[PDB]
């Protein structure tokens with residue numbers, strides 16, 4: 513029986529807990545808080561704006577996410593950044609999708 | 619008490635005096651690590 | 666070759682000529698970064714907790 517305390521989707525923290533049960537006796541059960549953080553290793557300060565360089569710092573405040581920028585992309589919401597595309601002398605300002613198969617129109 | 623004094627790890631004994639006690643007092647000591655030994659299962663995956 | 670030559674990145678290609686080969690030439694490359702299994706630099710800090 514694993515209970516999920518909090519879960520920040522775009523940070524991918526997944527703070528969970530479970531009470532392991534030993535033989536019946538005066539209480540010696542080990543309470544544990546189990547987290548599973550997926551570091552990107554390739555994302556930027558903005559995951560949407562390509563101009564920002566690679567981010568080395570990886571900040572994970574547990575209390576801040578239990579209750580802004582983050583590292584992991586989401587599969588539900590869209591990340592759209594404005595991008596310039598030029599054909600000839602003039603230019604047209606167009607949208608783009610940073611990641612594929614995430615929130616394509618249906 | 620101030621939190622910085624708590625972070626220093628004082629004895630912080632609570633002496634309770636009563637007639638029924640065999641020695642007429644009884645105190646307990648709290649500390650920064652007075653509870654479980656708190657063993658860590660820390661792991662780091664690089665798959 | 667000198668050691669300092671090996672320290673610097675050089676192709677140092679080896680060419681083998683034989684009639685039985687399809688293109689008759691076999692080329693192989695080697696340098697300082699050839700092979701070199703990945704080096705890990707785990708520098709972990711754990712004493713900042715100080716027992717909660």
Ligand SMILES: *[C@@H]1O[C@H](CO)[C@@H](O[C@@H]2O[C@H](CO)[C@@H](O)[C@H](O)[C@H]2NC(C)=O)[C@H](O)[C@H]1NC(C)=O
Pocket residue numbers: 557558560561
């Ligand atoms: C890097 O992150 C900053 C965070 O503030 C962003 O700047 C603004 O982000 C909001 C979020 O959608 C946009 O509506 C604004 O248009 C952004 N500002 C500008 C000037 O574009 C943005 O993602 C990045 N910063 C910049 C300067 O591009």
Ligand SMILES: *[C@@H]1O[C@H](CO)[C@@H](O)[C@H](O)[C@H]1NC(C)=O
Pocket residue numbers: 532544546547548659
């Ligand atoms: C921590 O260990 C327990 C086993 O006692 C396991 O059930 C749990 O999944 C582990 N946590 C994570 C994040 O894998």
Ligand SMILES: *[C@@H]1O[C@H](CO)[C@@H](O)[C@H](O)[C@H]1NC(C)=O
Pocket residue numbers: 657658659
């Ligand atoms: C860490 O310590 C606990 C306490 O005994 C142990 O159960 C666990 O297996 C240890 N982790 C590893 C990787 O051995």
Ligand SMILES: *[C@@H]1O[C@H](CO)[C@@H](O)[C@H](O)[C@H]1NC(C)=O
Pocket residue numbers: 659661
């Ligand atoms: C965590 O500790 C438990 C002991 O209850 C152990 O069985 C488990 O393998 C540990 N988790 C690891 C080593 O990832």
Ligand SMILES: *[C@@H]1O[C@H](CO)[C@@H](O)[C@H](O)[C@H]1NC(C)=O
Pocket residue numbers: 706707708
């Ligand atoms: C390995 O880590 C140590 C400790 O942080 C550091 O001093 C050293 O420069 C590192 N070696 C590298 C990055 O090649």
